[PDB]
RNA sequence: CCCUGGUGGUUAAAGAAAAGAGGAAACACCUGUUAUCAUUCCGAACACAGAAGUUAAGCUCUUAUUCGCUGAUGGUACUGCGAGUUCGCGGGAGAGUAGGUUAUUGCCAGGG
């Protein structure tokens, strides 16, 4: 059995058809779809505190399911007293089935558990179908336990879509039921 | 891939206590309790107090 | 009509020294190109050119006669030495005498406007206007008197009184050439 | 758009570097290049002193009726060896042609090897 | 207040040693250079310091492709 | 004064300046120009003396454009020294002008007043000059 | 012979963007990760297993030259030489302008 995420089932069985009708696309897979979700977290303070970076990496692992990579400093800078090549950030890429499952978990479970959650700004679009927005308190995810955290942390989420514009991606996200603050 | 650096992903059923909706979602969280999903499949059941359709926003 | 005619004769010298000798003989080397023809190399009388076209602009058009043919040519270029007031080459771009064509033509402002007299502000929005005519009838520059233009008045493009066979070509007919606010 | 274009560009860069690392082929020891489509598998032997294809083979050839598996390319390499021996060429230089020497190409090359062709 | 500077190295005598069309035999030096001002074409080789030398007897020739100069022996 | 605010190198070699002008030899921003009839160097300070003269003569009538900027150091050894050490030190700045450089351009005023003002300017420069109207407009 | 795919030579943008046409074959997108392989995480690339679907994209052809690139003829700068001196002879730009330019070609395979 090729086990399939419920999001993938929902997409393939409805969303393709509604978007074809709604945007008069000539051929079927002109329809937008999702290629990757990038979860990033920038801990510049890790240059003092290694525990911060280790905790962030581990907590990302529990949140998603796959291990993270610690990015390095592209340039040595003094304003943040950064030496080139130091560990400064940590990111995870989600693709395919894991991507769909994570996005489902997020939208239905973790966005609800945010303090004063009143939707998400439906305008954080880079003009090319890529939607990036932040979450300040990782504790919204029930996966991580409260006691073991060493410092409350946030993280940025970027969703990359095959769409050529923002309208297409916003329509796809709305069909997915993404709680945009509107 | 190589296989030694990943937490154990598991299929999990999340149950809303309020609306009763259940979500099938592959969570790394091991739940002590087991539930028979609609599909006759056993899944670790985690009960979550707040979910999608029971938004104070939707 | 003569004052738009220019006498030339062909040259076959083609050298720096040769051109210097010609200009010593008080003529001007010149070339004519356009209409896909072979370039024509010729020479012009400097005194005649000075007398007739002492005020030549990019939009001046004239007639070249080699005794055997007539050509309608724009003064595409003229290599002038300012210190010695010396022309030392002319480029003539030929056009078809009967083909309507466009060209930006500058404006010339005359009169003292009542609005500016009384406290108006000149703002010359447009320094030129796109007109349309056969080559021989293109206006050298289009005149505009501001005297009746009072305060808070802009000049419409149609308001420009135009020579006979010259016609406006601007897409925006209602744009303002000069305003007095 | 740009992503497919850059994938193409990377493939071309690899191909070019491989070519001038292995050098050109001569009638004595010509060059064997391969191409791996989504459906088929192509091989050509080229003499660059002429720009001529001395011999060639691919899974499109109906008579062979091979597939696109390791087994099939093993048999295809066997056929290529027997076709080249009758044209008495035993030394070849192996242009991997922008691919990585692994899997299908590994089996192809080793099959040419077990039957007396110097690659 | 004397001069702060005045210091120059020995000239290294770079440049093309055999002109295009000349006949060379194997091993001749053709160009001495820092960097591939001229690149290598057929039948020549490049030393560890980018010297151009002839792998076989022949006649030097320079070609130009996309603005880069190539040296060959034909 | 008029002087560059930053230089790659503080001192540069005095070339030989010769030939007429093949560029910057046409009236561009104005109505009347002050061409030179020689090839020489115009210091920044003579430049600003001529500029004062023109501007002061013009009672707000129009605008003045300066078509040369000095950017060339002129070094001079200390007063009493010998020929020893080398390349003494920048003293003042020079601009290069060749026969046919427009050098100065004026807008707005009547031609008579412009001619007067610009002879008043020419009285303070080290080169012969000529006042030119556009010679292709009026 | 031609279309397509692959592989050489001839180096002038043989360049990108926008719009239209097709897709039989071929090619590409596309399917699944479970088999060997790869990723400083990620079947994205690559690797392997296959053919449900498509011209949407890549690709091919046709487009205004919209951007770029290339480029006349003259003239000028500059230059060799001269018992002609701002000259006499020889060579001759760059830039600008009239324009032009979205290649061509050798041979391997499939079949029109």
From Swiss-Prot, chain A:
Which keywords, in A-to-Z order, does the entry hold? Ribonucleoprotein, Ribosomal protein, RNA-binding, rRNA-binding, tRNA-binding
Q: Which family does it belong to?
A: Belongs to the universal ribosomal protein uL5 family.
Carries keyword Cell membrane?
Answer: no
Question: Which NCBIfam families has this protein been placed in?
Answer: PRK00010.1
Q: What is this protein called?
A: Large ribosomal subunit protein uL5
InterPro entries reported in the protein's UniProt record? Ribosomal_uL5, Ribosomal_uL5_bac-type, Ribosomal_uL5_C, Ribosomal_uL5_CS, Ribosomal_uL5_dom_sf, Ribosomal_uL5_N
The record's note on quaternary structure and interaction partners says: Part of the 50S ribosomal subunit; part of the 5S rRNA/L5/L18/L25 subcomplex. Contacts the 5S rRNA and the P site tRNA. Forms a bridge to the 30S subunit in the 70S ribosome.
Q: Which GO terms describe its molecular function?
A: rRNA binding; structural constituent of ribosome; tRNA binding
Does the entry annotate any disulfide bonds, and if so which pairs? Answer: none
| tRNA-binding listed as a keyword | yes
Q: Which organism is it from?
A: Borreliella burgdorferi (strain ATCC 35210 / DSM 4680 / CIP 102532 / B31)
Summarizing the function annotation, the protein's role is:
This is one of the proteins that bind and probably mediate the attachment of the 5S RNA into the large ribosomal subunit, where it forms part of the central protuberance. In the 70S ribosome it contacts protein S13 of the 30S subunit (bridge B1b), connecting the 2 subunits; this bridge is implicated in subunit movement. Contacts the P site tRNA; the 5S rRNA and some of its associated proteins might help stabilize positioning of ribosome-bound tRNAs.
Where does the sequence pass through the membrane? Answer: none
Please provide the Gene Ontology terms (biological process) for this protein. Answer: translation
Q: Which GO terms describe its cellular component?
A: ribonucleoprotein complex; ribosome
Swiss-Prot record, chain C:
- What Pfam families does the entry give? Ribosomal_L25p, Ribosomal_TL5_C
What CDD domains does this protein's entry cite? Ribosomal_L25_TL5_CTC
The record's section on InterPro entries has: Rbsml_bL25/Gln-tRNA_synth_N, Ribosomal_bL25/Gln-tRNA_synth, Ribosomal_bL25_b-dom, Ribosomal_bL25_C, Ribosomal_bL25_long, Ribosomal_L25_dom, Ribosomal_uL5_bac-type
Q: A biological process (GO) annotation for this entry?
A: translation
Q: Which UniProt keywords apply?
A: Ribonucleoprotein, Ribosomal protein, RNA-binding, rRNA-binding
**Disulfides per UniProt:** none
Domain of life, per the record? Bacteria
Which Gene Ontology cellular component terms are annotated? cytosolic large ribosomal subunit
**Keyword rRNA-binding listed:** yes
Molecular-function GO term, any one: 5S rRNA binding
HAMAP family the record matches: Ribosomal_bL25_CTC
What does it do? This is one of the proteins that binds to the 5S RNA in the ribosome where it forms part of the central protuberance.
Q: How does it assemble?
A: Part of the 50S ribosomal subunit; part of the 5S rRNA/L5/L18/L25 subcomplex. Contacts the 5S rRNA. Binds to the 5S rRNA independently of L5 and L18.
Kindly give the NCBIfam families that the UniProt entry links to this protein. Answer: bL25_bact_ctc (TIGR00731), PRK05618.3-1 (NF004135)
Which family, according to the similarity comment?
Belongs to the bacterial ribosomal protein bL25 family. CTC subfamily.
Protein name (Swiss-Prot/TrEMBL): Large ribosomal subunit protein bL25
Please tell me the species this chain comes from.
Answer: Borreliella burgdorferi (strain ATCC 35210 / DSM 4680 / CIP 102532 / B31) (Borrelia burgdorferi)
Could you read off the lineage of the organism from its UniProt record?
Bacteria, Pseudomonadati, Spirochaetota, Spirochaetia, Spirochaetales
Curated annotation (Swiss-Prot), chain D:
CDD domains recorded:
Ribosomal_L18_L5e
Biased composition regions of type Basic and acidic residues, renumbered to the chain: 1-10
**Its biological function?**
This is one of the proteins that bind and probably mediate the attachment of the 5S RNA into the large ribosomal subunit, where it forms part of the central protuberance.
Protein name stated in the entry: Large ribosomal subunit protein uL18
Gene label: rplR
Summarize subunit and interaction data from the UniProt record for this chain. Answer: Part of the 50S ribosomal subunit; part of the 5S rRNA/L5/L18/L25 subcomplex. Contacts the 5S and 23S rRNAs.
Q: Name one GO molecular function term.
A: structural constituent of ribosome
* Record region (Disordered): 1-20
Q: Which organism is it from?
A: Borreliella burgdorferi (strain ATCC 35210 / DSM 4680 / CIP 102532 / B31) (Borrelia burgdorferi)
Q: Which UniProt keywords apply?
A: Ribonucleoprotein, Ribosomal protein, RNA-binding, rRNA-binding
Single GO BP term: translation
Pfam families attached here?
Answer: Ribosomal_L18p
Family from the record: Belongs to the universal ribosomal protein uL18 family.
What InterPro entries does the annotation carry? Ribosomal_uL18_bac-type (IPR004389), Ribosomal_uL18_bac/euk (IPR005484)
Taken from the UniProt entry, a GO cellular component term is: cytosolic large ribosomal subunit
Swiss-Prot record, chain F:
Composition bias type Basic residues, residue spans: 1-15
Is Zinc one of the keywords? no
GO terms for biological process? translation
Organism superkingdom: Bacteria
SUPFAM superfamilies reported in the protein's UniProt record = Ribosomal protein L16p/L10e
Keyword RNA-binding appears in the UniProt entry: yes
Give positions of region: Disordered. Answer: 1-21
Q: Which GO terms describe its molecular function?
A: rRNA binding; structural constituent of ribosome; tRNA binding
Q: Which CDD domains match?
A: Ribosomal_L16_L10e
One Pfam annotation reads Ribosomal_L16
Which Gene3D superfamilies did the record assign? Ribosomal protein L10e/L16
Q: Which UniProt keywords apply?
A: Ribonucleoprotein, Ribosomal protein, RNA-binding, rRNA-binding, tRNA-binding
GO cellular component terms listed in the entry, alphabetical order = cytosolic large ribosomal subunit
Task: Please describe what this protein does.
Answer: Binds 23S rRNA and is also seen to make contacts with the A and possibly P site tRNAs.
- Protein family membership: Belongs to the universal ribosomal protein uL16 family.
Query: What does the subunit comment say?
Result: Part of the 50S ribosomal subunit.
In Swiss-Prot or TrEMBL terms, this protein is called: Large ribosomal subunit protein uL16
Annotated source species? Borreliella burgdorferi (strain ATCC 35210 / DSM 4680 / CIP 102532 / B31) (Borrelia burgdorferi)
Instruction: State which gene encodes it.
Output: rplP
